[PDB]
């Protein structure tokens, strides 16, 4: 009944803050294992505070499904990547049973579904393309992306590797993928700066994060092409161990939250924007 739960920071879904002695407001305690040095395995769990759309969903589930939890931030990778059949990230923590569930901006996809059970989707996502207002690009199907060297100079676009976006591009557009890797970004903040400092023409990433970021962009310069259009549409889901006894009640509770208007309220609180 007292569950080990893994999360990963990614605003506004999961926001991590430093502790006050304890965690105040709508924040929940979350620990982070921090190494003493990079030449040892020794480290300590730092007490932090967690909030966000996904943390509010976890608070509602804990109350509805009736469980208590020990929330921790992942340190071996990010969302989840299969390396020589060995999963890292939040997916790996569930696979190797260090966590009963993973909560965050975790994309449901076919290869992660082979190793973990996913809840019903609770946030609509997929792949979106962010550009500075006025960049002429139809979508991922555009010849600027598909066949980039047909252009002089070629279109400069990239993603943050090792997540569900890069995995989908790798599986569907082999030329585009091998071309993009020189434009690989360390994270969303570096990518947005590269777009604004004219060092990047387009940033391809998780639709829900891009739409949030476009909606908050100061001066409303960065936009998602189409009407915030989504390619390879999917959703965020709770990952649970295969055959998990928690899945049933989690799905029923999520479907009840949509029905009651509790989900629309969370979208209003965390996801709406100015732009």
């Amino acid at each position: 009944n007292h569950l080990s739960i893994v999360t990963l920071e990614e605003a506004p879904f999961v926001i991590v803050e430093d502790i006050d002695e304890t965690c105040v407001r709508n924040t929940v305690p979350c620990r982070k294992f921090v190494k003493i040095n990079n030449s040892t395995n020794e480290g300590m769990n730092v007490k932090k505070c967690c909030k966000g759309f996904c943390i509010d969903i976890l608070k509602k589930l804990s109350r509805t499904v009736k469980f208590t939890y020990d929330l921790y931030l992942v340190t071996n990778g990010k969302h989840g990547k299969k390396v020589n059949n060995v999963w890292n990230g939040m997916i790996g923590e569930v696979v190797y049973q260090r966590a009963v569930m993973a909560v965050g901006s975790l994309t449901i996809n076919e290869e992660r579904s082979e190793v973990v059970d996913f809840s019903v989707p609770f946030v609509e996502t997929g792949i979106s393309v962010m550009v500075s207002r006025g960049t002429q690009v139809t979508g991922l199907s555009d010849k600027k992306f598909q066949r980039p060297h047909d252009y002089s100079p070629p279109f400069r676009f990239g993603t943050v590797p090792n997540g569900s976006t890069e995995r989908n591009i790798r599986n569907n557009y082999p030329y585009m993928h091998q071309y993009m890797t020189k434009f690989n970004q360390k994270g969303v903040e570096d990518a947005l700066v590269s777009l604004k400092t004219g060092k990047l023409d387009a940033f391809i990433y998780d639709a829900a994060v891009l739409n949030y970021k476009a909606g908050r962009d100061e001066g409303c310069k960065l936009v998602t092409i189409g009407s915030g259009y989504i390619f390879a549409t999917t959703g965020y889901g709770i990952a649970l161990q295969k055959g998990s006894p928690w899945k049933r009640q989690i799905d029923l509770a999520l479907l009840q939250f949509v029905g009651d208007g509790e989900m629309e309220e969370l979208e209003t609180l965390w996801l709406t924007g100015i732009c």
Binding site: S113, V120, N172, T233, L252, L255
Partner: protein
Amino acid sequence: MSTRLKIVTIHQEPFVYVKPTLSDGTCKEEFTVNGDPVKKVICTGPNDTSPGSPRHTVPQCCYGFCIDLLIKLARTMNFTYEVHLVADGKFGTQERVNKKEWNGMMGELLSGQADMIVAPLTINNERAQYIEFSKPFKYQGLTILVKKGTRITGINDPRLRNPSDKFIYATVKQSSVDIYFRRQVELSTMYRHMEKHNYESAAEAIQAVRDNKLHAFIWDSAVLEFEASQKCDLVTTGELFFRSGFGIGMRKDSPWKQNVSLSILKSHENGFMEDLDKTWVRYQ
């Protein structure tokens, strides 16, 4: 002898078109705008659609978004099947008989008359308590169909929240929209008006808006937006409310549930689902 999966579906354009066979018992060879042949299946179903009347099962032709999804699922997973249309022509609600019972496609799947529901079937809490739903193959919501020129802001329009015997609005009986209006306490005044005017089918309701008999039809936007794009005399109004997904329905003990969801994810990721949307749902 038979290991063939019994598939239940409902008539609901553009997901499932239902047409008569040719006098020889086959389906008319039709093609898409792309020049590709429309995949069609034989689907048995009653001819007398009238309630409380004898049902005479006849072979019919079934095609559409949901038929192409079934064919891709059958090929991906390697299963044989036979399609039939839901005998009572309903999606399915649980009704009081002290005992409770599921009607429509829900009823057929739980009785064993069907092994799988392949239709635009809404994923909701009530149904999920009894059956396994696949991961959604479509995410949409509810919208309102009206005759062109009728000014309605949406679900929060006074002509809806303050009901009158003048402005008549409705949905489909024994459907997920019906369930939603019945369970939600905030929509109690709206449900009491609706229960008197709800239709046996979406086709009957859409026709009744055309014939000035019904003023506003509350239904699935995937269906309404398509209908308004084809019948330019009808228009959808307002924004979407009660957003929900469509999924494949199976009994909880089904050995196919894992592979049905994996096939739906693969289809979302490889563009197949978007191609079905373009072929069937997306019309100018």
